[PDB]
Design an enzyme around this catalytic site. Structure first.
Site, PDB file in Angstrom:
ATOM      1  N   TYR A  45     -39.918 -37.584  23.724  1.00  0.00           N
ATOM      2  CA  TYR A  45     -39.756 -36.251  23.177  1.00  0.00           C
ATOM      3  C   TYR A  45     -39.102 -35.323  24.176  1.00  0.00           C
ATOM      4  CZ  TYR A  45     -43.570 -34.365  26.032  1.00  0.00           C
ATOM      5  OH  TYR A  45     -44.306 -33.895  27.056  1.00  0.00           O
ATOM      6  N   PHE A  55     -39.113 -25.896  29.588  1.00  0.00           N
ATOM      7  CA  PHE A  55     -38.720 -27.154  28.964  1.00  0.00           C
ATOM      8  C   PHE A  55     -39.547 -28.327  29.491  1.00  0.00           C
ATOM      9  CE2 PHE A  55     -34.482 -25.520  27.574  1.00  0.00           C
ATOM     10  CZ  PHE A  55     -34.476 -24.332  28.298  1.00  0.00           C
ATOM     11  N   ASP A  56     -39.623 -29.423  28.726  1.00  0.00           N
ATOM     12  CA  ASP A  56     -40.455 -30.556  29.114  1.00  0.00           C
ATOM     13  C   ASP A  56     -39.977 -31.798  28.382  1.00  0.00           C
ATOM     14  OD1 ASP A  56     -42.794 -32.209  29.939  1.00  0.00           O
ATOM     15  OD2 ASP A  56     -43.526 -31.885  27.839  1.00  0.00           O
ATOM     16  N   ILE A  75     -51.214 -31.154  19.702  1.00  0.00           N
ATOM     17  CA  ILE A  75     -51.255 -30.040  18.749  1.00  0.00           C
ATOM     18  C   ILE A  75     -51.160 -30.537  17.295  1.00  0.00           C
ATOM     19  CG2 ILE A  75     -50.573 -28.235  20.378  1.00  0.00           C
ATOM     20  CD1 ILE A  75     -47.736 -28.695  19.356  1.00  0.00           C
ATOM     21  N   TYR A 101     -50.543 -23.442  20.063  1.00  0.00           N
ATOM     22  CA  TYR A 101     -51.578 -22.965  21.002  1.00  0.00           C
ATOM     23  C   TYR A 101     -52.138 -21.597  20.611  1.00  0.00           C
ATOM     24  CZ  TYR A 101     -49.970 -27.088  23.611  1.00  0.00           C
ATOM     25  OH  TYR A 101     -49.657 -28.385  24.036  1.00  0.00           O
ATOM     26  N   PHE A 118     -39.492 -29.104  19.326  1.00  0.00           N
ATOM     27  CA  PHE A 118     -39.462 -30.444  19.853  1.00  0.00           C
ATOM     28  C   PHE A 118     -38.373 -31.240  19.166  1.00  0.00           C
ATOM     29  CE2 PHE A 118     -43.411 -30.711  22.293  1.00  0.00           C
ATOM     30  CZ  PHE A 118     -44.177 -29.701  21.804  1.00  0.00           C
TER      31      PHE A 118
HETATM   32  C1  LIG Z   1     -46.866 -32.998  29.903  1.00  0.00           C
HETATM   33  O1  LIG Z   1     -47.680 -31.838  30.073  1.00  0.00           O
HETATM   34  C2  LIG Z   1     -47.781 -30.982  29.016  1.00  0.00           C
HETATM   35  C3  LIG Z   1     -46.783 -30.785  28.082  1.00  0.00           C
HETATM   36  C4  LIG Z   1     -46.952 -29.858  27.060  1.00  0.00           C
HETATM   37  C5  LIG Z   1     -48.157 -29.155  26.968  1.00  0.00           C
HETATM   38  C6  LIG Z   1     -49.152 -29.347  27.900  1.00  0.00           C
HETATM   39  O2  LIG Z   1     -50.343 -28.677  27.872  1.00  0.00           O
HETATM   40  C7  LIG Z   1     -50.284 -27.273  27.789  1.00  0.00           C
HETATM   41  C8  LIG Z   1     -48.974 -30.276  28.925  1.00  0.00           C
HETATM   42  O3  LIG Z   1     -49.929 -30.530  29.870  1.00  0.00           O
HETATM   43  C9  LIG Z   1     -50.970 -31.453  29.494  1.00  0.00           C
HETATM   44  C10 LIG Z   1     -51.237 -31.521  28.023  1.00  0.00           C
HETATM   45  C11 LIG Z   1     -50.866 -32.494  27.172  1.00  0.00           C
HETATM   46  C12 LIG Z   1     -51.126 -32.533  25.699  1.00  0.00           C
HETATM   47  C13 LIG Z   1     -50.857 -31.216  24.945  1.00  0.00           C
HETATM   48  O4  LIG Z   1     -49.459 -31.153  24.563  1.00  0.00           O
HETATM   49  C14 LIG Z   1     -49.142 -31.295  23.268  1.00  0.00           C
HETATM   50  O5  LIG Z   1     -49.921 -31.455  22.378  1.00  0.00           O
HETATM   51  C15 LIG Z   1     -47.640 -31.210  23.037  1.00  0.00           C
HETATM   52  C16 LIG Z   1     -47.239 -32.441  22.232  1.00  0.00           C
HETATM   53  C17 LIG Z   1     -47.335 -33.643  23.150  1.00  0.00           C
HETATM   54  C18 LIG Z   1     -46.274 -33.550  24.187  1.00  0.00           C
HETATM   55  C19 LIG Z   1     -46.408 -32.291  25.023  1.00  0.00           C
HETATM   56  N1  LIG Z   1     -46.818 -31.094  24.265  1.00  0.00           N
HETATM   57  C20 LIG Z   1     -46.564 -29.848  24.694  1.00  0.00           C
HETATM   58  O6  LIG Z   1     -47.019 -28.883  24.055  1.00  0.00           O
HETATM   59  C21 LIG Z   1     -45.850 -29.653  26.018  1.00  0.00           C
HETATM   60  C22 LIG Z   1     -45.123 -28.292  26.101  1.00  0.00           C
HETATM   61  C23 LIG Z   1     -44.551 -28.080  27.497  1.00  0.00           C
HETATM   62  C24 LIG Z   1     -43.927 -26.710  27.637  1.00  0.00           C
HETATM   63  C25 LIG Z   1     -42.757 -26.602  26.650  1.00  0.00           C
HETATM   64  C26 LIG Z   1     -43.207 -26.848  25.219  1.00  0.00           C
HETATM   65  C27 LIG Z   1     -44.035 -28.138  25.025  1.00  0.00           C
END
Ligand SMILES: COc1cc2cc(OC)c1OC/C=C/CCOC(=O)[C@@H]1CCCCN1C(=O)[C@H]2C1CCCCC1
Length: 128
Positions: A45, A55-56, A75, A101, A118
């Site tokens: 992703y 960004f990530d 999420i 969130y 995403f």
């Molecule tokens: C890789 O590290 C992270 C990425 C994101 C969010 C994070 O937490 C705030 C996070 O740290 C740990 C948490 C992981 C699960 C929660 O994350 C999600 O549910 C979603 C979907 C799964 C992939 C990641 N994603 C995110 O929300 C990213 C986030 C990063 C900032 C830009 C937007 C997306």
């Protein structure tokens, strides 16, 4: 841009039809089968905030992102969104805070009331 397009042509895949999660298929996958709840799911992703400040990507950790669908580890937008995808598909999701969130955010990674975009590729999903 890619998120504009999702605002414009994207399918609302929420139950409440509140446009909380919009989807576009960018590359069509293979097969009729989509992941069931509890399935182990493998994705790549790329993700960003709509404020454009963060960004990530999975690719950066040099490892697919693996999670169990519906088990509350991602999420709600992901549980809803990846359930709609077929092996090999690539999709774009635009997501409002209620399916991400929310008002509390996840400070400071995610600010209050953030919208998220995403691009997700469904690699594989195994049964538990
Ligand atoms: C890789 O590290 C992270 C990425 C994101 C969010 C994070 O937490 C705030 C996070 O740290 C740990 C948490 C992981 C699960 C929660 O994350 C999600 O549910 C979603 C979907 C799964 C992939 C990641 N994603 C995110 O929300 C990213 C986030 C990063 C900032 C830009 C937007 C997306």
């Amino acid at each position: 841009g890619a998120p504009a397009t999702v605002t414009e042509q994207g399918e609302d895949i929420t139950s409440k039809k509140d446009r909380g999660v919009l989807k576009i298929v960018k590359r069509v996958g293979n097969g009729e089968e989509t992941p069931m709840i509890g399935d182990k799911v493998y994705v790549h992703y790329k993700g960003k905030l709509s404020n454009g400040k963060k960004f990530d990507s999975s690719h950066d950790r040099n490892e697919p992102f693996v999670f169990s669908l519906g088990k509350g580890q991602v999420i709600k937008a992901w549980d809803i969104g990846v359930a709609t995808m077929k092996k090999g598909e690539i999709a774009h999701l635009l997501i409002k805070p209620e399916y991400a969130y929310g008002s509390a955010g996840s400070l400071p990674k995610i600010p209050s009331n953030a919208t998220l975009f995403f691009e997700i590729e469904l690699l594989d999903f195994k049964g538990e």
